[PDB]
Amino acid sequence: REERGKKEEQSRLRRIAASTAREIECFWSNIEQVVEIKLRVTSVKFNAPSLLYGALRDYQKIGLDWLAKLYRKNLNGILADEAGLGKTVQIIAFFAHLACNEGNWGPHLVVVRSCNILKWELELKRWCPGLKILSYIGSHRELKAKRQEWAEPNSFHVCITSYTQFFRGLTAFTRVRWKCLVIDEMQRVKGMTERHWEAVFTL
């Protein structure tokens, strides 16, 4: 009886401590859940699949192989394929291969329409996730805060910019060096009388 009473007192102390611990942990979990809810809401073909989580199709891989000559031979051409084949996935695989083969990453730029910014970053995060990407919103105040970690540090290797935003910050983008300048749906870049030509030329 004495030893059982001692053990029962020890167990009661243990259980009181455990109840207090459960209570504090539950309150901390509620706080963390609230915080998370507030925050959230003659053609050589040898490609490396490292960091390529998104499965690619046969014709997609073939197209990737045909375009390996550009980066290897320092050539530039137009990619005019019918919609539905995922040109964005091909460009993502190209960016991944540029690192899988050579150790150079560099800062990159991608011009996307205003109604396609979210779509492009979503696709980037889906296909071949591992990358550093940044968005461009709030040309007045928000961008000023984002442009405070670009000069010295390589905070991001790829950037998804918009057409209308370039013309208001040409003095800023022309300072930093870039390797790849992707522009999709060139239909808006078919009029010589537009000022976009001379704005994008000096890049």
Binding site: R14, I24, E25
Partner: protein, 349 residues
């Protein structure tokens, strides 16, 4: 989410923390060493009055001089808390393993002199675990008087797996002394206190831990007179983890931080070691050393069984790790259990 306005105190060996509940930072912070001829404040550390003896209420992590404890508590309630100590609960932070007699004496003294309406105390490891937001884990505290690996399961210290090593305030207060003397150099107690203060400043300034076994390192300068110190600054911190690395000034055996953690985890019962290894928590003042957590992590990985996860808390970047106990104590008095599980005024009477 009820708040009554409780004052959470934490009698540390180097700095005492105190402040009203519901805050994310200790409002009160000053040296705990008491200078008796009887001044306890940064002023006491500064004022060069008549012969003064520098001592602290804590000794080996246990309150020995109750007079100094009463003095510091009164000084706090008078100047820092700036409020009468009779209409505010108190959440005392005892040592990792407090004794029956000590807790009884504390409760008696409180309920008699201060007449606190509600007084409760809990372990420090559980407070730190709650501050980090996890119930189960392994607290690795390294204070100014002791370092202990306290395995906690559901917010209760597993007294069977506790361990301790000689790593205390004597870390470099006398090693860095000779390290500096190698090149060149109110009572004796006050001189030793000032020496320890300047050595701690030198520590926070230049002391750094290496990523692997001791190796050559470039020199760095810092004022105190000015001098340039070579790899000497990277030598003493080596004794924290590996005893074989420090073969000249570490005796024949020494349980380093990694060895201490391994022993603490091994002494625990089965069915809980995976949770402990998965959630490892660090604490204390010595953890603020540069590249300390990095070496700890990259070394414990080697001394880790197979298929056992090792995910520590990446809070060392912030200086609040040393105050994790105070943060836990403060957030503790913002719950519903504060009214359910608590010691009222008429439980001991």
């Amino acid at each position: 989410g009820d708040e009554v306005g409780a004052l959470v105190f934490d009698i540390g060996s180097y700095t005492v923390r105190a402040g009203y509940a519901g805050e994310d930072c200790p409002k009160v912070d000053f040296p705990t060493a008491i200078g008796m001829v009887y001044y306890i404040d940064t002023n006491a550390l500064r004022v060069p009055r008549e012969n003064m003896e520098a001592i602290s209420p804590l000794k080996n992590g246990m309150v020995e001089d109750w007079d100094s404890f009463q003095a510091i508590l009164d000084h706090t309630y008078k100047m820092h808390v700036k409020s009468e100590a009779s209409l505010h609960p108190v959440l005392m932070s005892e040592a990792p393993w407090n004794t029956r007699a000590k807790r009884e004496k504390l409760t008696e003294l409180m309920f008699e002199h201060y007449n606190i309406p509600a007084f409760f105390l809990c372990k420090t490891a559980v407070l730190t675990a709650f501050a980090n937001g996890r119930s189960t884990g392994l607290i690795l505290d390294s204070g100014a008087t002791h370092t202990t690996a306290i395995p906690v399961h559901d917010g209760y210290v597993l007294q069977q797996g506790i361990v301790k090593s000689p790593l205390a305030g004597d870390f470099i207060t006398m090693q860095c002394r000779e390290l500096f003397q190698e090149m060149n150099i109110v009572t004796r107690s006050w001189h030793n206190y000032m020496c320890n203060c300047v050595i701690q400043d030198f520590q926070a300034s230049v002391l750094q831990v290496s990523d692997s076994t001791y190796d050559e390192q470039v020199a760095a300068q810092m004022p105190t007179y000015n001098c340039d110190f070579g790899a000497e600054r990277l030598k003493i911190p080596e004794g924290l983890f590996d005893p074989s690395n420090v073969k000249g000034l570490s005796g024949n055996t020494m349980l380093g931080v990694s060895h201490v953690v391994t022993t603490s985890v091994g002494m625990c019962d089965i069915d809980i070691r995976p949770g402990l290894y998965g959630s490892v928590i660090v604490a204390g003042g010595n953890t603020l050393i540069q590249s300390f957590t990095d070496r700890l992590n990259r070394e414990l990985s080697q001394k880790t069984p197979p298929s056992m996860r090792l995910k520590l808390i990446a809070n060392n970047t912030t200086v609040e790790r040393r105050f994790s106990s105070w943060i836990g104590g403060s957030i503790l008095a913002s719950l519903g259990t504060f009214q359910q599980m608590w010691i009222s005024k008429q439980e001991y009477e």
